Amino acid sequence: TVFSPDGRLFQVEYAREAVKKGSTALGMKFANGVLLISDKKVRSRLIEQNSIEKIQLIDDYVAAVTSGLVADARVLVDFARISAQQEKVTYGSLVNIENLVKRVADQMQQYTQYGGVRPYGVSLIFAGIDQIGPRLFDCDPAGTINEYKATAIGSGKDAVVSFLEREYKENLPEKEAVTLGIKALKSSLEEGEELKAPEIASITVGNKYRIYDQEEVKKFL
Amino acid sequence: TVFSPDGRLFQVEYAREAVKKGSTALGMKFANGVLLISDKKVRSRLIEQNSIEKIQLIDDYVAAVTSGLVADARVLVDFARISAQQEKVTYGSLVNIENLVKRVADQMQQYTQYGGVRPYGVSLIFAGIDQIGPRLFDCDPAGTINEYKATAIGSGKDAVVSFLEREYKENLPEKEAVTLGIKALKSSLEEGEELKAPEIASITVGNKYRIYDQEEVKKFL
Amino acid sequence: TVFSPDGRLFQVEYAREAVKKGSTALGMKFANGVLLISDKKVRSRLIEQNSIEKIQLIDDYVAAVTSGLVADARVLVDFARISAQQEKVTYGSLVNIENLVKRVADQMQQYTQYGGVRPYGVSLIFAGIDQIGPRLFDCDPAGTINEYKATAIGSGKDAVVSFLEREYKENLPEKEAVTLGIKALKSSLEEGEELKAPEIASITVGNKYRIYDQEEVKKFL
Amino acid sequence: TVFSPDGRLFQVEYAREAVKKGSTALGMKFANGVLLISDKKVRSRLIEQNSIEKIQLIDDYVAAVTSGLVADARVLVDFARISAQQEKVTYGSLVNIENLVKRVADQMQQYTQYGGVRPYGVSLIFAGIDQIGPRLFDCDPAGTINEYKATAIGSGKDAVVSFLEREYKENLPEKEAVTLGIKALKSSLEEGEELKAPEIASITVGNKYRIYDQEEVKKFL
Amino acid sequence: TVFSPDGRLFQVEYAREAVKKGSTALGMKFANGVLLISDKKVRSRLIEQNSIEKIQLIDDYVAAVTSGLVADARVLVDFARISAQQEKVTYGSLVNIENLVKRVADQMQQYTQYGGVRPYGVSLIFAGIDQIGPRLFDCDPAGTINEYKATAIGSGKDAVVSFLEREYKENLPEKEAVTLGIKALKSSLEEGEELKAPEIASITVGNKYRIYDQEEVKKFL
Amino acid sequence: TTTVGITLKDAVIMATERRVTMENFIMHKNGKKLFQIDTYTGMTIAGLVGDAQVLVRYMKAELELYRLQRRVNMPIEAVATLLSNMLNQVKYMPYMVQLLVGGIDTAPHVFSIDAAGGSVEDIYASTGSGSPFVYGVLESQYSEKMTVDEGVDLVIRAISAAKQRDSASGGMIDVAVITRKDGYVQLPTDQIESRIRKLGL
Amino acid sequence: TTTVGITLKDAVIMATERRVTMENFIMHKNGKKLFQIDTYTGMTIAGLVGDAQVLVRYMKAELELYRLQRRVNMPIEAVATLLSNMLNQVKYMPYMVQLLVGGIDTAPHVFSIDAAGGSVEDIYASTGSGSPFVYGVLESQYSEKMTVDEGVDLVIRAISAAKQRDSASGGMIDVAVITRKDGYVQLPTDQIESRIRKLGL
Amino acid sequence: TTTVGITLKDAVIMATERRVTMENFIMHKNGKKLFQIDTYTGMTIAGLVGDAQVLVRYMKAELELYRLQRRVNMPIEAVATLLSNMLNQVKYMPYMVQLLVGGIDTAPHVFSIDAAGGSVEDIYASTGSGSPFVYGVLESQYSEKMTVDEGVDLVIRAISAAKQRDSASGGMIDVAVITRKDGYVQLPTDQIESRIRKLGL
Amino acid sequence: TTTVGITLKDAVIMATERRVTMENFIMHKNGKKLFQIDTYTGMTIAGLVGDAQVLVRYMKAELELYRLQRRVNMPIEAVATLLSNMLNQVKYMPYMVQLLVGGIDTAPHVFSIDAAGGSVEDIYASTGSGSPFVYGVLESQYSEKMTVDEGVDLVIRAISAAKQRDSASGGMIDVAVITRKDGYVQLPTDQIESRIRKLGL
C-alpha cells in the first residue's frame, strides 16, 4: 500500500469496494438501548438457516455485525472477542466500548501501512452498553472510527442511511425503533423484491444482549 | 494477493478454478446421521484401488472429503487431524465440530492475506456428529464456512446441487438417503458415461463413523 | 521511498497531499498560554457529535490536533501518549515538550527511510506548557519540526496562515486570542459557507489544559 | 542502491542533489580555534526564531552544522551525540574527534550498500577541539570524510568555497575570522538579497564551545 | 547479482569500473622489504593535507592502499584491522599475511553472491612482512587474490604496470626501488601534468613499517 | 479455610467460610472464596489468595469465550480438565491452591483439583485447613437421598463444626445452590442465619 | 511503618507516619508514604522503599493513561486488580511491599493488597509493623456511623498508639481525606497538630 | 567511608574522606568519592569502588546528554529518580553502593539513595561506615539558619569526629560548595587545612 | 606473588618476581608477570594465571587498535578505565586478578585495579601475597625526590624483603623502567644481579 499523486491509498479504496458488495445491516440507538438488524439474504433451501447468524456477540453486553469479505470478518470478530477478554482479565471489567473498537481498528490500520499484507475487506458495526451508556460505532477498512445515533453498512448502506436521516427520531420505544428499522431495510430493496425475516438483536440498560426469536421477528416484518 | 479495482481477489478466484477441476463428492443429512459419497474416478488397472480412499477420517466421529489440488488437500486434512487432537487433550473431548472447521478455515484465510504464499486450491466437506447433532459444513479457498442440509463439491457440484435442491427430502432413512445420493451423482455424468462404485461413508447418532464395504456399495449402484 | 533525480522523495510529497485534504485547525500563543482551535465539520445528524473530539490530550499540560488520514493520526496520538508516560516514569516529570515532539517525529521519519512501509499521512500541532513556557510545534509527514508563535494545518492552512501573518499580535488576552482565531478560520471558508461552533481548548501557565464548553464557544462564534 | 555501467551509484548522487537544496553554512580554522557560521534564512514572522538553532552541540567541545533533509539531519545528530557519550563512558574522555566523525560516516555508508533503505540526504560539518588541536571535517551522503582548513555546505557551497580559496588566511584572530566568514556568505547571495544575522559559534583551545549572542552577531553583519 | 547468458556478473564488472576512477598507487618488492607508493592528488589549498593519508596500517608489519569508492575502502580497512587483532589474540601472533587478505576477500566475495547488497567498489593492495618473508597482494571487488612481485591499482594501473613489466628488477636497494616507483607513476600522468610529492612507506625484514617524511619524499621526486 | 461441595439427585450445593488470614492474623473477616464462573458452574478456592484470584479471572474469561464461540456451556469435566492442564504446566513453579469445581450438565458433578493438576470426581469434597472436620460430619450424616433443604442444613452443620476447631476458619457462611431450573443461586444471609438459629448452632 | 485507611458513609480517610529506616537506624524523619495516584484515589505504601516507589510511579502513569484513553477515572476495584496482576506476575521475584488503595467511585472503597497480588476489600485496614496496634484501637472504637471529623480523630489516635509501641513508627502524621465533593485533599499540619493537642496525645 | 551532605538557605555543602580500603588494608590514602556530575550537581559515593565508579560514569553521560537535548540542566529530583530506576532494575544483582545526590535548582536539595533504588530527600544526610558519628555531631550542632562558612566548619567537625572512631575512615577532607552564583566549587586544601587548625582539630 | 610499581619525577618503575605456583607447589621458577602493553605502558599481573594471561592479550589488541585508529597512544587513565569496565561487566563471574597499570603520558601514573573493576591512582602500589612486606619497605624508605637509580634500588630491596617472608614469592627479579626519552625498557639480569650484590641482598 503506497500513496498515489493525489495522496490516496488505492488498496484501501479497493477494499472499500469489496465492502459495498456485502449484505446490508443497520444499527440505531433508542431509549436506554441499542438495536442491530441484519438483512440476511435467503438463498437455496439446502442451507441450514438455523446455524446462520449475522449478529455476533463479543461479550454479554457487546455485539457486532459485519459486511464485506466473510472470511476476513470472521477473523476480526475473533480478534475482538479475545481482546475483550484480555481487558476483563486485566481490569476486572469492560468500562468503555470505544477502546475495544479502537483495538480492532488499530489491527486493521496497520495492514494499510505495512507491505506484505492486504487490508481487511470488512466494515463493522459495534453496539453495546457500558459505563457511559448505550453506544454504536462503525469501523471501515482504513481503520476509521465514528460513533453514530444511527448507521448502516453494506450494499444498501446509502439507501438505508438516506431513509434514516429523514425518519430517525431519538428516544424511541424499542418496538418503534424496530418498526422503523424494518421500514429502512425495505426501502433499500431492488424493485420487485421482498424482505425476508431479518436477524434482530437489542440490548437495554441493565440487561444482557437479547436476540429476537423467529416469531418475534415476523411480528414486525 | 491484492485487491482489484472491483474489490476482488484474483488469486482466490483462480484457486476456485482449480477446485472446479477436482472430483465430485456430496454430503447430505438424514434421520439421525450424515452421509458422505465420493465419485471416485477409476482409471487404468495398474492402480492399487484398495489403497485409494477419498473419505478421510479426522476422528472417530468426524470425516471429510476434498476436491481440488490433491497435495494441498492432504496437508489440510493432516492439519485438521492434529487440530482435533489438540482440542481433545485440552478439554477432554470434542464438543462442537463447527470450531474444528473454523480452525481449518482460518489456516486457509491467512494465505489469502499474507504475501509470499498462495491460497490453498482446495474445497472441503466436513461431516460428523457432536454435542448438538449431525452436522455438515463446506469450506472454500477463501476460508468461507457454511452449514448445509445437503451439498456438493467438485466439477459436478452444480449438477449435483441442482438435483438435490429439487429431490432432497429431510429425515430420510439411511438407505433412502444413499439411494438419492447415487441418483444425484449419476445426473452429473457426461453423456455416455457411467458411475463406478463410489466410496460411501455414514454416521448415525451414538455410533462411530461407518465406511461401506464394496458389496454394500454395489447394492445401491 | 527512494530519491528522484531532483533529490526529492515522492512518497513523502504524496503524503503531504493527503494532509492537504484534512480538516483545518490552528494554534496560537497568547499572554501566558497557548490556544488550539479545530474547525470541526458538521455532517449529517446521525453522528454522535458529543463523542467527536478533534483536540486530543497527551497529558494534563499537553494537547494536540491532527489533520490528514484519520487512522494514522490516531496511531501517532497513541504513540505520543505512551511516550509521554515513559518520560514521566523515567524522570518523574515532563520538562521539555520539544523532546516529546521529537520522539514522535522520529517515529515518522523512519517510515520515509525504510522500505516495506509507507509514511504517515498526518500533520500534527502540539501545544502545552512546560519548564520553559507555553510552546507550539508543528510536525509534518517527513518528520520536520518547527516552533511557531502561530500556525495552522489542513486544507485551510494557507488561508489561515496568510490571515494570521497580517493580523496576529503578541501577548493578547485569552479572549482576544480566541476572537482572532475565529476570524482566521472564517477567512478560509468557501464562499457561501459558514463556521460551525469549533472545538476550542486553551492552557495558561500554572493551570491544566482547559476545554471550552459548547456555550462558551458560541459566545465567540 | 546498485552500480550503473559507469560504476556510479545513482541513489547516492541523487541524495547529493537533495543536499544542494539546503541552507548554506561554513566553517573555518583560526588561531587556536574553530569557527562555525550558519546562514539561517528568515521566513515569516510567526516562527519562534528564538527556538531555531542551526548549530548543534554534540558535546561541550564538539559542534556541527547540517544541510539537506532536515529530518535526516536530526537523526544523524542524535546518533553522533549518543556515540560521543559511549566513547566517554568507555575511555573516560574523547581524544580524537576524527573517530566520532567516522562512526557517523559509517552509519551513513551502510545505507548506500544495503537494500531496503535509502541513503541520508545530509551533509555535515564537524568542528571542535581535541587532544591534537582544533579540527574541522565534512561528511557527505556517500560517507566520505575530509579534513579542511576551511569549508562550506549547502546551496551556497560553491560560491563560499570559491571566495574562501582566494581570501582565506591562516592563523587569523577570531574577530578577523568572523569578519571574513560574513563576507564569504554575502558573496553567495542572490542579486538584490541581503544577509540576515547568521548564527555564529566558535571555540578556542582550553575553552568550551561558545555561541554568540544576537548583539554580538550584528556587530559583524 | 545474477549471471548473464555469458556467465558474467555485471554488478561485479560495474564495480570494477568504479575502481578504475580511483587514485593510482603501486607496490613493489625489493631486497628484504616491500614498498608502497600512493599518488595523492592535490586539490585546493583549503584541505588539511597533513591529515590526508593514503597508506593505512593494519598492524605494525602490515599496510595497505586502496582505490575506488572511498567510503567502501574505509570500511574494508577497518574490517582488516579488526580481523588482524582477532588472529593475534587467538594465536598470539600473525604468521601468514595471506590469510588476513583472504579473510578480507571472503568478506567481499559474499557481497557478489547474496542479494540485498551491492559489491564493494574497492581494489586493495596489501603489503608486509611475516613468517615467510616480504609479501605483496592484490584484492579486487570479485574477491580475487594474487601475489605479486610488483603491481598497481587505480586509473593509472595499466600505465604503471606496463612500465614495471619492462623496467622492474628484482632485489633492488630500497633507494633504487623508490626511484623506480616514482618514474613509474610519472609515466602514467596526463600530458602537461606533474607528480606531486607522493606518499611513501616501506618495510624491511626485522623492522616495523616505516613511513617517509615530507622531505624524504621530495629527495626522490 | 473451609470449603464444602456436595451433590444431590439434581443439585450441587457449595459453601465456604469468609475469614482471610494475612501477615499471621485475621486481617479480613469478610473475604470471598465462592465464585460463579459460569451459568451453572461455581468454584471455591483455597490456599494462597493471590494465586487463587488470578485463576478465577482466567477461568471466567476462558469459559465465557468458550460459550460464545461454541454456543454452548462448557461441560463440567472439561472445566476441570482445563485447570488440570493449566496447573500441571507450571507444576515446578506451581499455584499454591486447592480448588473445587461444581456444576450441572446433564448431571451434577463435583471435582477436586490439587496444585499438581490432579483432578478427581466425587460425591462430596472439601478443601482447606478445616476440611478434616467437614469430612467427619459428612461421613457420618451425608445421605444420597437427601433433599436440597436437608443438603443445605448439612453443609451449614459441617462448616459450623470446622469453625469450632480450625483456628484458620471463621466468618459468615456463604452458600450457593446450583440447579438446572434456577441456575447458580447465591443464598441470602437472611436465610442462612435463619437456618443457623433453627439448627441450634 | 504504620498506614491506616478507613471508610465512612461517603468518604475515605487515609493516614501514615513519616519515619523511614535505612541501614538499621532512623535515617529519615520525614519521608512519604501517602500518595495521590488519581483524582479520587490514594495509595499508601509499606515495605521496601525502593520497590514501593517504583510501583507508585507505574500506577500514576497507568491511571493517567487510562483516564485519557477512556475519558473516565478508573474504578477503584480495577485499580486494585491491576496491582494484583502486576505483583502476581513476579511472585517468584516479588516486590517486597504491602499496599492500601482507597478512593471513591459511587462508593468509598479500601483495598488491602499483599505482595502475592492478593487483594481483599474491607471497611478498614492497616499495614506496616505497627498495624497490630492500629487494629486494636480501630476494633474497639471504630463506628460505621462516624462523621468525617470523628473519623480523622480516630485515625490520629490509632496511629498515635502505634507510635508508642512500634519502634519502627514515628514522625509527623500525614492525613488525607477523599470525598466526591472535594476530591483528594491533603490536610495541613496545622490542623493535624491542633487535633493532636485537643485529643491529649 | 564517610560522606556528608547538608543544605543551607541557598547552598549545598558536601564533603568526604579520601581513604580507600582494598584487600583488607589501607591500600590508598588519596582516593576520590566526591564528584561533580553537572553544573550545579554533585555526588558522593560509598560501598564497592568498582560499582560506584561505573555509576558515576553513567550519570555524567546521562546528564550531559539530557542537557544538550533539552537545553536545560536536569532537576535534582529527576537525577535521583534516574538512579532509583537504574538501581532497582538490578535489585537482584545489585550495585553495592550508597549514594548522596545534592545540588541546586530553584532550591538546594539532598537525596539519599540506597542500593534498592530507595530515594529519600532530607536536610542533611551521611553515608559510609562512619555515618553514625556524623549524625551524632549534626544532630546536636546543625542549625537551619547557619551561614555557608558556619556550614563548612560543621561539616569538617562532623567528619573529623568520624575519623576518630571509624577505622575505615581517614585521609584529607574534600569539601565542595554548590551555589547558584558560583556553581559547583571545590575548596582548596589550603582553606580546609586552615579551617582545621582554627577549629582545634 | 609480588608486584611493585612506583612513580618518580619523570619515570615509572615496575618490578615483579617470577615464581608461579600450580597444583600447590613451585611448578615454575621462571614465569612472567610484567608485560609491555604499549610503547609507554606496562602491566603487572597477579592472581589466577589463566585469567590474567587472557586479559593481557585483550589489552594488547585493544591498545594497538586504538593507536592505529586514532594515531595516538592511549592515555594511561583511559587504559585503566577500559579494564575497569571489562572487569566490572563480569563482576558476578569475575576474573580472579589484581592488576597494576603504569606508564607515561604527560606525567607518570600508576593505577591499581581490583577484580571488581575498582581503579585508583597512586604514587606507589603493590599486588600479590607479598604486597604487605613491600608496603612496609616503601612506607619507610620511599621518597618523592628519588632518582631513577635510587628508585630501582628501592624496588629491589622491597621485593627482596617480600621474598624472605612470603612463601609464594621467589625467583629472579624483573625490573622495567618507563621514560619518555627511552620508552619501556626492560633491565638486563646482569644489571639487576649487580645491584643485588651491591645492596648486600
Q: What's the one-letter identity of residue H99? A: L
Coil, strand or helix at G141: helix
CA distance F28 to F15: 18
CA distance I176 to H21: 28
DSSP 8-state class, residue E170: S
Q: Do the chains H and F touch each other, judged by at least 3 C-beta pairs below 8 angstroms?
A: no
Distance from CA of I68 to the nearest CA of E (A): 7
| Contact assessment for residue C196 and residue C40, using Cβ atoms and an 8 Å cutoff | yes
Distance from CA of A57 to the nearest CA of F (A): 7
Q: What's the one-letter identity of residue E1? A: T
CA distance H146 to H169: 26
| Contact assessment for residue G158 and residue G17, using Cβ atoms and an 8 Å cutoff | no
Partner residue facing F78 (CB), from B93, B99, B132? B93
CA distance F32 to F28: 10
Q: Looking up cell 566517554, which residue turns up?
A: D88
If residue I16 lies in a helix (H) or strand (E), which one and from where to where? strand I11-16
Chain A to chain G Cβ contacts (< 8 Å): 28
Residue of C nearest to G63 (CA): C85
Q: Which three cell numbers stand for residue H122?
A: 532530607
Residue of I nearest to D98 (CA): I70
Residue E172's domain spans which residues?
1-221
Best of F67, F76, F81, F84 to disrupt the B interface (most B CBs within 10 Å) is F81
Contact call for B91 and F82, based on CB within 8 A: yes
At residue B192, what are phi and psi to the nearest 5 degrees? 95, -10
Query: Chain-centre distance of CA D55, in angstroms?
Result: 8
Coil, strand or helix at E61: coil
Contacts of I39 in chain E (CB under 8 A): none
Contact call for C114 and D116, based on CB within 8 A: yes
Query: Which residues, other chains included, contact H38 with Cβ-Cβ below 8 Å and sequence gap of 6+?
Result: H63, H64, H67, H73, H74, H79, H103, H184
Q: Which segments of E6-121 are extended strands (E)?
A: 25-30, 33-38, 55-59, 62-68
Q: Which three cell numbers stand for residue A42?
A: 435467503
CA distance C97 to C61: 10
Distance (Å) of CA D193 to CA A74, D41, D186, D189, H179: 65, 11, 9, 6, 48
Contacts of I64 in chain E (CB under 8 A): 59-60, 85
Contacts of C112 in chain D (CB under 8 A): 71
Laid out side by side, the sheet with C62-68 consists of C55-59, C62-68, C122-129, C134-139, C145-147
Candidates D118, C70, C18, C111; CA nearest to A4 is C18
Q: Which segments of chain A are extended strands (E)?
A: 25-30, 33-38, 55-59, 62-68, 122-129, 134-139, 145-147, 150-153, 199-204, 210-211
Q: Looking up cell 559489491, which residue turns up?
A: E119
Q: Are strands G174-179 and G183-186 parallel, antiparallel or unpaired?
A: antiparallel
CA distance H101 to H112: 7
Resolution of the deposited coordinates, in angstroms? 2.8
Q: How many CA atoms lie within 13 A of G187 on its CB side?
A: 25
Q: Which three cell numbers stand for residue I172?
A: 629472579
Q: Looking up cell 621458577, which residue turns up?
A: I29
Query: Which residues, other chains included, contact D106 with Cβ-Cβ below 8 Å and sequence gap of 6+?
Result: D143, E74, E75, E78
CA distance G49 to G23: 12
Q: Which segments of I17-72 are extended strands (E)?
A: 20-22, 25-28, 34-38, 41-44
Candidates I59, I102, I60; CA nearest to I82 is I59
I200 Rama sector, left if φ>0, alpha if ψ -120 to 50, beta otherwise: left
Query: Chain-centre distance of CA C190, in angstroms?
Result: 22
Beta bridge partners of G106: none
Q: Any alpha helices (H) in chain C, and if so which ranges?
A: 10-19, 70-91, 97-109, 157-167, 174-186, 214-218
Distance from CA of A119 to the nearest CA of G (A): 25
CA distance E197 to E215: 9
Which CATH number does the domain housing residue D98 bear? 3.60.20.10
Distance from CA of B102 to the nearest CA of F (A): 10
Residue of E nearest to D111 (CA): E117
Q: Is G20 on the interface with H (CB under 8 A)?
A: yes
If residue B174 lies in a helix (H) or strand (E), which one and from where to where? helix B174-186
Q: Do the chains H and D touch each other, judged by at least 3 C-beta pairs below 8 angstroms?
A: yes
R_g of chain F computed on alpha carbons: 16
Contacts of H88 in chain G (CB under 8 A): 50-51, 54
CA distance C129 to C204: 8
Catalytic residue, chosen from H1, H3, H16, H44, is H1
Contact call for A14 and B7, based on CB within 8 A: yes
| Contact assessment for residue F39 and residue A71, using Cβ atoms and an 8 Å cutoff | no
What is the total count of domains within chain E? 1
Candidates D137, D142, D154; CA nearest to D28 is D137
Contacts of D154 in chain C (CB under 8 A): none
Candidates G107, G51, G56; CA nearest to G82 is G56
Q: Is G78 on the interface with F (CB under 8 A)?
A: no
Q: Looking up cell 446450583, which residue turns up?
A: F178
Contacts of H65 in chain D (CB under 8 A): 81-82, 85
Residue of C nearest to H71 (CA): C96
Partner residue facing A51 (CB), from B105, B147, B165? B147
Distance from CA of G194 to the nearest CA of F (A): 31
Candidates B13, B37, B28, B5; CA nearest to B197 is B37
Candidates E156, E193, E162, E139; CA nearest to E22 is E156
CA distance A200 to B67: 37
CA distance A175 to A220: 9
If residue G16 lies in a helix (H) or strand (E), which one and from where to where? strand G11-16
Three-state SS for F24-92 is: CEEEECCCCCEEEEECCEEEECCECHHHHHHHHHHHHHHHHHHHHHHCCCCCHHHHHHHHHHHHHCCCC
**Residue H1: active-site member:** yes
Partner residue facing E20 (CB), from D7, D113, D150? D7
Coil, strand or helix at D52: coil
Contact call for E117 and D115, based on CB within 8 A: yes
| Contact assessment for residue F141 and residue F155, using Cβ atoms and an 8 Å cutoff | no
Exposed, middle or buried by CB within 10 Å (0-12, 13-18, 19+), for A18? Answer: buried
- Angle H68-C81-G90 from CA coordinates, rounded to 5°: 95
- Angle A38-A43-A44 from CA coordinates, rounded to 5°: 150
- Angle H103-H105-H106 from CA coordinates, rounded to 5°: 130
Report the structure determination method. Answer: cryo-EM
Query: Which residues, other chains included, contact H59 with Cβ-Cβ below 8 Å and sequence gap of 6+?
Result: H37, H43, H79, H82, H83
Q: Which three cell numbers stand for residue D178?
A: 568572523
| Contact assessment for residue I149 and residue I159, using Cβ atoms and an 8 Å cutoff | no
Q: Is H120 on the interface with G (CB under 8 A)?
A: yes
Residue of I nearest to E79 (CA): I65
Q: Is E82 on the interface with D (CB under 8 A)?
A: no
Partner residue facing A95 (CB), from G70, G82, G85? G70
Best of D52, D58, D89 to disrupt the H interface (most H CBs within 10 Å) is D89
The DSSP code sequence of G26-70 is EEESS---EEEEETTEEEE--B-HHHHHHHHHHHHHHHHHHHHHH
At residue D87, what are phi and psi to the nearest 5 degrees? -65, -45
Candidates B26, B37, B34, B29; CA nearest to B200 is B37
Candidates D194, D82, D67, D167; CA nearest to D120 is D67
**DSSP3 helix / strand / coil % (chain F, rounded to 5):** 35, 30, 35
| Contact assessment for residue A199 and residue A37, using Cβ atoms and an 8 Å cutoff | yes
Query: Which residues, other chains included, contact F122 with Cβ-Cβ below 8 Å and sequence gap of 6+?
Result: F110, F111, F112
CA distance D143 to D12: 10
| Contact assessment for residue A22 and residue A68, using Cβ atoms and an 8 Å cutoff | yes
Give the Cβ contact number of residue A157 at 10 Å. Answer: 21
Candidates H22, H33, H49; CA nearest to I116 is H49
Contact call for A85 and F57, based on CB within 8 A: no
If residue F108 lies in a helix (H) or strand (E), which one and from where to where? strand F108-113
Q: Any alpha helices (H) in chain D, and if so which ranges?
A: 10-19, 70-91, 97-109, 157-167, 174-186, 214-218
Q: Which three cell numbers stand for residue H42?
A: 554533585
Query: Which residues, other chains included, contact F26 with Cβ-Cβ below 8 Å and sequence gap of 6+?
Result: F19, F20, F170
Domains contained in chain I, CATH given = 1-201 (3.60.20.10)
The DSSP code sequence of C32-91 is TEEEEEE-PPP--SSB-GGG--SEEEEETTEEEEEEE-HHHHHHHHHHHHHHHHHHHHHH
Coil, strand or helix at G172: coil
Catalytic residue, chosen from I1, I41, I44, I127, is I1
Distance (Å) of CA E5 to CA A191, B146, E2, E115, E117: 64, 53, 10, 19, 22
CA distance D79 to B163: 73
DSSP 8-state class, residue A51: G
Beta bridge partners of I183: I179
Contact call for H50 and I87, based on CB within 8 A: yes
Distance in Å from the first CA to the final CA of chain H: 19
Contacts of C149 in chain D (CB under 8 A): 45-48
| Contact assessment for residue H158 and residue H138, using Cβ atoms and an 8 Å cutoff | yes
Distance from CA of G57 to the nearest CA of H (A): 10
CA distance G159 to G165: 10
Q: What's the one-letter identity of residue D166? A: R
CA distance I49 to F128: 60
Candidates D34, D37, D16; CA nearest to D152 is D37
Contact call for C92 and G57, based on CB within 8 A: yes
